[PDB]
Design a protein around this ligand. Sequence first.
Ligand code: HEM
Ligand SMILES: CC1(C)[C@@H]2CC[C@@]1(C)C(=O)C2
Length: 405
Amino acid sequence: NLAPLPPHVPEHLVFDFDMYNPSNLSAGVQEAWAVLQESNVPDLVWTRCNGGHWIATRGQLIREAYEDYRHFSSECPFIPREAGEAYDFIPTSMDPPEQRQFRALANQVVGMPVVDKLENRIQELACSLIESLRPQGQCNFTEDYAEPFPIRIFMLLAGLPEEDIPHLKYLTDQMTRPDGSMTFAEAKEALYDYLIPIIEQRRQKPGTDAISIVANGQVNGRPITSDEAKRMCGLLLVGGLDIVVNFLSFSMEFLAKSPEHRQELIERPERIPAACEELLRRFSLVADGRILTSDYEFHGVQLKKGDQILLPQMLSGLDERENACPMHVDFSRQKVSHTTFGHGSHLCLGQHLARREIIVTLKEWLTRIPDFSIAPGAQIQHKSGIVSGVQALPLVWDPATTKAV
Ligand code: HEM
Ligand SMILES: CC1(C)[C@@H]2CC[C@@]1(C)C(=O)C2
């Protein structure tokens, strides 16, 4: 389904890439997206898919546009437009300066200090989950660990019942990887319907959970409104329940496939933090965009007000000009360049939490289960969207080779 080419788009800049169902998805989602970095593809293209929009394919352009909120606004960050228009999450839907006050509050609930106090619990959860799988000699990593681990830590942070996980997991998936089961606006509304009563209570009888902190916070020297709290909590939920889960699967899929890379970390664990950075670069999984606030000539290309441009955070680190042999995983890369956590004023506020969750997983897993592989005959399926993911990851190992720690 391709939309009619607009009057201002030169035919030679057209490249019909569908971010929700790329071509060589069989080669892996990152590989599927990297086709935009081929020699026969211009730096900036227009795709007639998903309503029609631009795509910046180079790290230089992606970074540039993310710094220029004057022309590239985040008020409409999702494609298709219907989604971007319904998008009202705080603080992402706001451009500076207004966005700044909310970023501070959000940092109070997911910032480093909060993660720090949670360290022992994150560790215990990783160790507990892994140890219970170890004897089995097999597991579907996505649902046996990738999902329960990060999701349980966040439900803990936000003080929400584990009984609500299934519902929230479903809603957040609808927002990042539309199943067609419901529109973004519809999934967002359901999410807000769930959140409103909770924010009301937390405001009356406030606990110590992140929702209670956001709900009774102060911004710009005045109290945050119920509406603002709701819009901020919704983003925190989507960010905390959907991203790390999928990133862990991409990483484990690779490690299950590369024994040499597993050994490297098993022998030199001090190299894990560095390994984390390289994996975050190689298996970057986010891609959203901005909307043109006015007609603008970007690198010789005429952009029109209202035009939407996809600025894939995932593509920057895969760009050959940013990192040599971008597709090769090298834990000793001295210069790991990437925009996996964003760029500009909207830099990810949950970086510390994500890194710790990834680092703790790698360390505790390779400690008890150093040797494992993908169940033979398994075909790992990837999914593309605002946040790309892995359907399932059937793993196997010989229990005689594991160590109870
Ligand atoms: C590996 C996991 C993660 C990745 C790759 C990631 C990536 C991103 C990216 C690329 C953005 C920028 C979006 C834009 O500029 O339009 C972002 C924003 C944000 N992320 Fe993360 N994120 C991750 C995990 C999390 C987690 C764990 C949370 C915590 C709940 C979170 C909370 C946020 C928030 C609140 C923002 C908004 C910041 C702002 O608009 O000023 N993220 N993230
Ligand atoms: C693009 C994102 C990854 C970022 C955090 C969650 C997300 C889906 C948003 O709506 C902002």
